[PDB]
Amino acid sequence: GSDLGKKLLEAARAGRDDEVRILMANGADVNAADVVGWTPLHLAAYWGHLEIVEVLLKNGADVNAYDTLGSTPLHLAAHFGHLEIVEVLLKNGADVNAKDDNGITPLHLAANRGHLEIVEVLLKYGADVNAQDKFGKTAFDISINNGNEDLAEILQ
């Protein structure tokens, strides 16, 4: 639709904090999606740009936008160990139990990558510890398979 939409995806992508103010001010669609269904909030979440995440939520960015495979900005922040972004998304209403097309939750992804500080925050906000993916696997199962005892301790 909008040319500013596209430019907003690109600046959120590349971490350009100032260009994201200027494009919002000028009416850029904060929920503009690229071809894989990633919004500025996804891009900012994946590349760990805290300030951009904050600027976008403040301008009405959809906190639970999903991509063409069912994955939400929280999924991405959780998987790439961006703690402070995980806290911000969860404060702005991110669905802590959002499942993607595979039935994967942010807890599964945090757990698989051994991001402990994030696993705690997710459980804090009501993450379901017994949530199964399409194969039957829980975050606990993931801990046993990766032989990460520290993470196993936390999920009993």
Residue partners of 138: CB distance under 8 A and separation at least 6: 129, 130, 131, 132
Taking residues 6 to 45 in sequence order and writing x for each that binds another protein by CB under 8 A, - otherwise, the string is x--------x------------------xxx-x-------
Selected binder of another protein within 27, 58, 134, 153 (CB under 8 A) = 134
Residues in contact with another protein, total (CB under 8 A)? 22
SS3 content of the chain, % helix, strand, coil (to 5): 55, 0, 45
Return the number of the residue (79 or 92) whose C-beta is nearest another protein: 79
- Cα gap 75→94, rounded to integer Å: 10
Nearer to another protein, 37 or 59 (CB): 37
**Is 51 in contact with 21 (CB distance < 8 Å)?**
no
From the CB of 108, what's the least distance to another protein, in Å?
Answer: 10
Binding mask 95-124 for another protein (x = CB under 8 A): -----xxx-x--------------------
Q: Which of 150, 152, 125 is nearest to 141 (CA)?
A: 152
Q: Which is nearer to another protein, 124 or 134 (CB)?
A: 134
- The DSSP secondary-structure symbol of 67 reads -
The one segment of 25-33, 88-96, 119-127, 131-139 that binds another protein by CB under 8 A: 131-139
Contact yes or no for 67/41 (Cβ under 8 A): no
- Asked whether position 150 contacts another protein by CB under 8 A, the answer is no
| 3-class DSSP state of 11 | helix
How far is the C-alpha of 57 from the C-alpha of 67, rounded, in Å?
17
Among 12, 24, 61, 71, binds another protein (CB under 8 A): 71
Binding site for another protein (CB under 8 A): 3, 6, 15, 34-36, 38, 46, 67-69, 71, 100-102, 104, 133-135, 145-147
